[PDB]
Design a protein around this ligand. Sequence first.
Ligand SMILES: O=[N+]([O-])c1cc([N+](=O)[O-])c(O)c([N+](=O)[O-])c1
Ligand SMILES: O=[N+]([O-])c1cc([N+](=O)[O-])c(O)c([N+](=O)[O-])c1
Ligand SMILES: O=[N+]([O-])c1cc([N+](=O)[O-])c(O)c([N+](=O)[O-])c1
Length: 316
Amino acid sequence: GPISPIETVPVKLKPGMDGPKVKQWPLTEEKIKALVEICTEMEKEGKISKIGPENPYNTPVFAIKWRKLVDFRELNKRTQDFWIPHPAGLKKKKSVTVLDVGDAYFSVPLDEDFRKYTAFTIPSINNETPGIRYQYNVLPQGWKGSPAIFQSSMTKILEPFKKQNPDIVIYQYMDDLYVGSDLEIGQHRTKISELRQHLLRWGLTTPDGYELHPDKWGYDPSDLIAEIQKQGQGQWTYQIYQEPSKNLKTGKYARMRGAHTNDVKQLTEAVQKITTESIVIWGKTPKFKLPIQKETWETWWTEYWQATWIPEWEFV
Ligand SMILES: O=[N+]([O-])c1cc([N+](=O)[O-])c(O)c([N+](=O)[O-])c1
Ligand SMILES: O=[N+]([O-])c1cc([N+](=O)[O-])c(O)c([N+](=O)[O-])c1
Ligand SMILES: O=[N+]([O-])c1cc([N+](=O)[O-])c(O)c([N+](=O)[O-])c1
């Protein structure tokens, strides 16, 4: 749908910070084609615009039906802060459905003076020739500012559902809603559908959600660390903690060998599951320590990464 110019909100970088300049890594010809197709459609719809030679910023993109993912980590660090509470009962619910509500953002303009800092490049084959440069004209998915700016509209949209379903907990984290109830699974799913239809009535398309059942699964609100380690061979272990001695949670996953898997793919799965669990339990995304070289991770992680968010991580 079309945007409303009066919903443009002024935004800026943190004092004395410039915009991001993180280079586009090489992509496969398949991924480049997909990005060209996606970006040609976004441009036709006014959501991005080609930029000229003056703009010096850059944020990396990649492709994962294909979807474009932007790694806004550096822009997010440089973006101003914005002036939710996590329900302790969300993890006690029989079911929690996660819904991606990032589609909302395409309908909301981005401050024209901030657009330049969202510049990105569709790379050429092997990065041999200059790529195709674009910036965002609307709130971008994965950008810190987008859920903050949309919160007032999200609240107005959710209000009738919340008023009619007091037994349902709705917690928002970044670009997702976590919808929790103790209903029979069929009844819970019906409430999810009613919620998706409400969102859609207001122009918010959502993917099918993914279902958690966390009642089958000393925190200090002031950073979370998740460490994954190799346990011999054959399985993975992880520790979630803030101070080194006391763990808050520990767990295991299998480290399987096969023609369709590898350590990076499995580690990305584990990162996504530990993150989701951490958001549910504590409302925080951990920083990760992964049992792999940075070079091998930096090489391959984008090949399997299905999340719209991207956490911070260290290595051996
Ligand atoms: O990847 N990059 O960071 C990047 C950046 C610029 N630039 O103007 O700041 C480019 O012109 C290109 N380029 O044209 O391929 C790439
Ligand atoms: O397409 N590209 O994103 C691209 C990227 C880079 N770079 O170093 O990141 C280049 O140097 C060139 N290049 O040299 O044309 C192109
Ligand atoms: O291909 N290029 O012409 C090119 C140009 C610029 N630039 O800022 O003028 C870059 O930053 C990059 N880059 O960072 O890859 C590439």
